[PDB]
Write the structure tokens for this entry.
Amino acid sequence: MKSNEHDDCQVTNPSTGHLFDLSSLSGRAGFTAAYSKSGVVYMSICGENENCPPGVGACFGQTRISVGKANKRLRYVDQVLQLVYKDGSPCPSKSGLSYKSVISFVCRPEAGPTNRPMLISLDKQTCTLFFSWHTPLACEPE
């Protein structure tokens, strides 16, 4: 119950006893981000991403190129949720680093669960994709 961020896709706020559930957001298709010539990405907000070799967390599903392995590692800080899938494909752009996908869950009641983390920016130098999902699921206004 103390540390959940690496265990299950849930966050416990011990100051108000509020559990956040992002674990029910597991799926076969997951959430999809339609993106340019690079392609459309599949994203598992929890678990592992399918339509690509199961065990990735973010992958272009049309080419099955991994851009983050499924490591259930979410981040709860300053009332803004985040989850990261790193070390998918090796990036030969700048340094010998991998491509990683970071999803920033902006706690905003401006969308519902059908909405999804879109790609707002992609730093091709650090080989990092920045997704953002404005969702009240991330922080529930109680």
Remarks:
- The chain has one domain: 1-142.
- The chain has no helices and 13 strands.
